[PDB]
Design a protein around this ligand. Structure first.
Ligand SMILES: [K+]
Ligand SMILES: [Mg+2]
Ligand SMILES: [Mg+2]
Ligand SMILES: [Mg+2]
Ligand SMILES: [Mg+2]
Ligand SMILES: [Mg+2]
Ligand SMILES: [Mg+2]
Ligand SMILES: [Mg+2]
Ligand SMILES: [Mg+2]
Ligand SMILES: [Mg+2]
Ligand SMILES: [Mg+2]
Ligand SMILES: [Mg+2]
Ligand SMILES: [Mg+2]
Lengths: 260, 59, 134
RNA sequence: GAAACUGCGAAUGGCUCAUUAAAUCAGUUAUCGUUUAUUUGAUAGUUCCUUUACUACAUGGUAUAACUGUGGUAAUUCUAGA
RNA sequence: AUUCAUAAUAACUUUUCGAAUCGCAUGGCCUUGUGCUGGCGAUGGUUCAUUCAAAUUUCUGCCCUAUCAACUUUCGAUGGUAGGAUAGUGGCCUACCAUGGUUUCAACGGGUAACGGGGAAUAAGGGUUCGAUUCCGGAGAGGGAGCCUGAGAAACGGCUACC
């Protein structure tokens, strides 16, 4: 009440951060940024908890302000900077890069990309609109406004950013039989190929997605994220490829690995 | 009462006590900004002209 | 000999802090525990360090004694160790000295006393001096 | 780097359950009915005195805190005159 | 789905913004000069988008009571038109007009030793009872009312008045 909140109590934090219940009363409240705080991964959570490069928040601040970590090629010394889906994190040391994608178990995963993959990213068009002076623009999911887009670009389409300059190199239309990603709902982390989409005027269009080995499911259009055509994706996939194999099947792989 | 009389061109300021309350009534029923002679105020102020800039009552 | 048999595990290079982190297990039969200074020294001649770039944590001994496990950092020099490590552990290891601060309550009380003062206060100091010397 | 001016915060947190019975709240909606500091992305070649006033843009001036001093009140994080 | 986004014409403005700001390196060309030209940032700064929000908001769902059966409406009750006011919709307020609106499918009134919920105890199944209290939402800072500064307060470790 009386104004915006500044504290995020622990157990109110998003569960996919995988914060422990003890060792703290509060959780890192992500700052205002490109991503909504529910589906954003703060740099303190990614460093201290996911990468174990820091032991405490003070060391996290020491890492951040030195101009070590650059998010999408920009330093962003904010501790709770809301890094989200498809974001590219480059580290000056160790000569390696991470992309931020979910795993099939519905949480952001440490995925290592090369430099050529780090040199770009894919985003989802939230809207296409004419601005002042009639310049058209596309708004991605990460709050990027790019002027003069291709006229064939429509809403919920995928655009490849150059990440060093605010331009689009190419795009993928929203059409049937194109490999996609899921960023919402119970299917958080899946990767599949479209079957069709239902019209459903007035709100909440529904899309039917088929997995690699025919695990057919449906989800809202809001959660869909086109990533390529049949095979040959534009983004290297994380460990798992978002398939959601059964509990008994992963039990088989675990007893295979430790039972040899 | 006491008079915080200040000469501004050199920034000098001194306090003079003026008893004989039947002579401080030249100040009476005047207000800030009203010029008053120095002759009635005192036998020391021949030709000095003052003006009221402020004050502090008892309390 | 005593045969501590100090083994380092979970070793990770962290050039982001110019240090290597690890957990360390020490096996000390018929011995209570291991001293931090001697453990830091042994880590120094293991890593060809100079006994000052080494920091240690924990060493929660198992039940019944005989084995301790704790965290450890080995740096590249004194300079980044002194810039990255906390003051309290610097005072532990003897590089720096504990700063003589007043207790927290009287520090706060003095700050609240200074809140009631506008400016330096030499004006009111000489005014109360005049009132005391009238 | 004391002080002070400026900026920002102080609307968060923390506490309590008095009020409150379609009120609050829960799930679910709408803003094609609005405000939004700050973060992130983009984003002002046009200022011709409100023209026959282009007079400094190698860059306009006022008035003040702080500080120096005179003080008043028993007293307040009171303050006035220069 | 629009009188949308935009764009064009005609004008209007206590004429809003369009850098008289700060730190490092201080290069290139000679017309060798208080010559020309230059990066890394920081704080700013109209507008759009994004984010953290907020405010209103649709549907459905609350305990006991008829020893509570009618209730609301000159003093806004329910609508219409226009205006005012607000960030904006809207009887929110005003003027004029119409006479509506709820109710035994329990309105209205009264009581609550009532903050609501996630939940807790018990539990064959079905249920019963509790939830001031860790999380979320609301409300309040002795009781009312009013208000300044601000993006955000009807703030109280802000102010003003009364008790
Ligand atoms: K009306
Ligand atoms: Mg609060
Ligand atoms: Mg109206
Ligand atoms: Mg109550
Ligand atoms: Mg409760
Ligand atoms: Mg109670
Ligand atoms: Mg609460
Ligand atoms: Mg309140
Ligand atoms: Mg009390
Ligand atoms: Mg403010
Ligand atoms: Mg109040
Ligand atoms: Mg208090
Ligand atoms: Mg408070």
């Amino acid at each position: 009440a009386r104004g915006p909140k500044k504290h995020l109590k622990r157990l109110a934090a998003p569960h996919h951060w995988l914060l422990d219940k003890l060792s703290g009363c509060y959780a890192p409240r992500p700052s205002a940024g490109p991503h909504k705080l529910r589906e954003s991964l703060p740099l303190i959570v990614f460093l201290r908890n996911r990468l174990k490069y820091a032991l405490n928040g003070r060391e996290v601040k020491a890492i951040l302000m030195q101009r070590h970590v650059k998010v999408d090629g920009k330093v962003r010394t904010d501790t709770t900077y809301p890094a989200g889906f498809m974001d590219v994190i480059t580290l000056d040391a160790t000569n390696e890069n991470f992309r931020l994608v979910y795993d099939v178990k519905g949480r952001f995963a440490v995925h290592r990309i090369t430099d050529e993959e780090a040199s770009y990213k894919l985003g989802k068009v939230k809207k296409v609109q004419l601005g002042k002076k009639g310049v058209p623009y596309v708004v991605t999911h990460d709050g990027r406004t790019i002027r003069y887009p291709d006229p064939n670009i429509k809403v919920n389409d995928t655009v490849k950013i150059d990440l060093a300059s605010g331009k689009i190199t190419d795009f993928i239309k929203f059409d049937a039989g194109k490999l996609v990603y899921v960023t919402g709902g119970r299917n958080l982390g899946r990767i599949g190929t479209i079957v069709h989409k239902e019209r459903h005027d007035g709100g909440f269009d529904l899309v039917h997605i088929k997995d690699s080995l025919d695990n057919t499911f449906v989800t809202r259009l809001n959660n869909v994220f086109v990533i390529g055509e049949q095979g040959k994706p534009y983004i290297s996939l994380p460990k798992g490829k978002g398939i959601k194999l059964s509990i008994a099947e992963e039990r088989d792989r675990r007893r295979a690995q430790q039972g040899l | 009462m006491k008079l915080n009389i200040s000469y501004p061109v050199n920034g000098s300021q001194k306090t003079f006590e003026i008893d004989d309350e039947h002579r401080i009534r030249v100040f009476f029923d005047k207000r800030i900004g009203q010029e008053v002679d120095g002759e009635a105020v005192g036998d020391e102020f021949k030709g000095y002209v003052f003006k009221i800039s402020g004050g502090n009552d008892k309390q | 000999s005593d045969a501590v048999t100090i083994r380092t595990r979970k070793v990770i290079s962290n050039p982001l802090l110019a240090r290597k982190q690890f957990v360390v297990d020490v096996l000390h039969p018929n011995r209570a525990n291991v001293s931090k200074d001697e453990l830091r020294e042994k880590l120094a001649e293991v890593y060809k360090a100079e006994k000052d770039a080494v920091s240690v944590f924990g060493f929660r001994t198992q039940f019944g004694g005989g084995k301790s496990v704790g965290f450890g950092l080995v740096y590249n020099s004194v300079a980044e160790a002194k810039k990255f490590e906390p003051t309290y552990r610097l005072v532990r290891y003897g590089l720096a000295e504990k700063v003589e601060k007043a207790s927290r309550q009287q520090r706060k009380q003095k700050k609240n006393r200074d809140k009631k003062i506008f400016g330096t206060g030499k004006r009111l100091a000489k005014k109360v001096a005049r009132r005391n010397a009238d």
